[PDB]
Amino acid sequence: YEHTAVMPNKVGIPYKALVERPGYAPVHLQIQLVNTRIIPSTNLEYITCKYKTKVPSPVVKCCGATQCTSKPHPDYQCQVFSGVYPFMYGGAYCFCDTENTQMSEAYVERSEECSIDHAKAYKVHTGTVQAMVNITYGSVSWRSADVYVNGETPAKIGDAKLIIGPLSSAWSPFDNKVVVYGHEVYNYDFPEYGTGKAGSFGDLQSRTSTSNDLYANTNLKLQRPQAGIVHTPFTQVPSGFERWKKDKGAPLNDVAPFGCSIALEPLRAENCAVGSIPISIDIPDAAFTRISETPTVSDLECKITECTYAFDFGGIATVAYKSSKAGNCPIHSPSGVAVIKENDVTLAESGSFTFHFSTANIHPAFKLQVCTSAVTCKGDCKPPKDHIVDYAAQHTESFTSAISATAWSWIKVLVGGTSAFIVLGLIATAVVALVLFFHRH
Amino acid sequence: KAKCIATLAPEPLVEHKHRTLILHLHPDHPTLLTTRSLGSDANPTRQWIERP
Numbered sequence: 051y052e053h054t055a056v057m058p059n060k061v062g063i064p065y066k067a068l069v070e071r072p073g074y075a076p077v078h079l080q081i082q083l084v085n086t087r088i089i090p091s092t093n094l095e096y097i098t099c100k101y102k103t104k105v106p107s108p109v110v111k112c113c114g115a116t117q118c119t120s121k122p123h124p125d126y127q128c129q130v131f132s133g134v135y136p137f138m139y140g141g142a143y144c145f146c147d148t149e150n151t152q153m154s155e156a157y158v159e160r161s162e163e164c165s166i167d168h169a170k171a172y173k174v175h176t177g178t179v180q181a182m183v184n185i186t187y188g189s190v191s192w193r194s195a196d197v198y199v200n201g202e203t204p205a206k207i208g209d210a211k212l213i214i215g216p217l218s219s220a221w222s223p224f225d226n227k228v229v230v231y232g233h234e235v236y237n238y239d240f241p242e243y244g245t246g247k248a249g250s251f252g253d254l255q256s257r258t259s260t261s262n263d264l265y266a267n268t269n270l271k272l273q274r275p276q277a278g279i280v281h282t283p284f285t286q287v288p289s290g291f292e293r294w295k296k297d298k299g300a301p302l303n304d305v306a307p308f309g310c311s312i313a314l315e316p317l318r319a320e321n322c323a324v325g326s327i328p329i330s331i332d333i334p335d336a337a338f339t340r341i342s343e344t345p346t347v348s349d350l351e352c353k354i355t356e357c358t359y360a361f362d363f364g365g366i367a368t369v370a371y372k373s374s375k376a377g378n379c380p381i382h383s384p385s386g387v388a389v390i391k392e393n394d395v396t397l398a399e400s401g402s403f404t405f406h407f408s409t410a411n412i413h414p415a416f417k418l419q420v421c422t423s424a425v426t427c428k429g430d431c432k433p434p435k436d437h438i439v440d441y442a443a444q445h446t447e448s449f450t451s452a453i454s455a456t457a458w459s460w461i462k463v464l465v466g467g468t469s470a471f472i473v474l475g476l477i478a479t480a481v482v483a484l485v486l487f488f489h490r491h
Numbered sequence: 492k493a494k495c496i497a498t499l500a501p502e503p504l505v506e507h508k509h510r511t512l513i514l515h516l517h518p519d520h521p522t523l524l525t526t527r528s529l530g531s532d533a534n535p536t537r538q539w540i541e542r543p
């Protein structure tokens with residue numbers, strides 16, 4: 051039997067319903083999401099990391115001159131400094147006083163840390179949505195499996211076939227461009243490859259951490275060696291990756307709305323409480339028992355013994371009943387006024403049973419279904435004492451949930467009196483208008 | 492890649508008021524405090540707490 055319904059996109063809050071198959075006793079169904087994962091499709095654009103400046107041994111030409119040539123090296127620099135007279139540990143290196151040249155060379159490489167300490171720039175496109183669903187029904191214990199939240203792919207969970215509809219909201223916390231560094235994700239419109247500026251995030255760009263074509267854009271400039279010293283001095287703009295790591299700011303992990311939890315393997319946003327999720331579950335035909343084979347419950351009377359509209363199961367109610375064929379009978383409240391903690395109760399030939407519920411209404415009025423029967427529960431609920439709690443609300447608050455009977459009474463008096471004032475004035479006008487007509491005629 | 496032991500700041504004192512969370516922070520070293528709403532507007536907060 052296929053049961054179709056819509057459940058909210060909430061994690062840790064179970065969805066409860068009664069599967070009512072004509073001719074069979076209701077089968078209690080409970081569907082709880084363990085996690086919801088939005089897994090977008092990503093394409094690695096390039097990898098950024100701290101650069102290393104490689105400086106080969108300078109060519110010191112004594113009594114002569116040399117010339118620089120271009121080479122296929124990132125940010126390659128070459129300059130010939132004439133008029134040098136370097137000294138070594140063994141004395142003057144060159145003979146001529148000024149007819150000597152030192153050719154300095156330098157180029158940018160990926161540092162050793164780039165294998166581990168680097169940021170991956172990704173293009174993010176709409177991907178897939180998956181969830182872990184925990185389901186129990188009738189006398190079948192909790193079973194779970196990974197499912198695809200697409201409304202098409204069915205999943206077999208404990209002999210039951212579950213189809214989870216697509217999320218009503220297509221919202222995703224990732225922008226078209228994200229930067230992944232370590233365990234953190236940043237929404238960052240990184241520069242296109244080959245466009246990174248010196249001292250900025252993209253100063254060093256590589257298509258992959260093992261590529262042999264590196265883009266480097268630093269103001270690497272060779273300076274003249276100090277008088278008499280064989281060395282290759284240079285100036286360069288400090289690494290824009292090191293700068294970025296200082297100024298990264300808040301990661302997406304700390305600013306994603308709806309409480310999303312960001313994971314990287316694969317990149318995904320977990321437990322985003324957005325919209326609702328249509329569902330369809332085909333319950334096995336063996337889970338249903340004929341009406342005549344289940345207990346008949348009658349003379350139901352529901353008394354609310356205690357109630358507070360707290361986020362926990364603050365309500366307590368006692369239901370008196372009369373029955374036959376003592377046995378288990380499911381309990382459910384079809385309306386959103388109250389969420390019942392217990393899923394089923396054991397009924398004797400006569401007596402009473404108690405159940406707990408959570409409600410946001412100051413004067414809750416809800417229907418309670420006891421298998422083949424139902425009763426209406428009414429009462430008053432006190433305000434909760436705790437200002438802050440460490441758990442989410444089980445119930446749902448409606449527009450009129452907070453309006454007390456006293457507030458309704460004042461609204462009725464307001465509208466009734468206000469309307470009567472205008473109505474009486476209009477009637478008086480109509481009566482005098484008729485009298486004036488009869489005066490003329 | 493290795494596993495390093497990072498400091499663990501002292502547990503904050505938490506006081507509760509109507510729709511308000513009051514935290515008394517007594518850090519040993521500059522400690523980052525971040526918060527966000529779980530609604531449609533994260534309204535994130537990020538500040539380094541260096542003294543009580």
Ligand SMILES: *[C@@H]1O[C@H](CO)[C@@H](O)[C@H](O)[C@H]1NC(C)=O
Nearest residue numbers: 082084182184185192193194
């Ligand atoms: C499903 O729910 C039951 C009861 O809440 C629990 O025992 C079980 O571990 C849950 N499944 C998973 C995968 O956590």
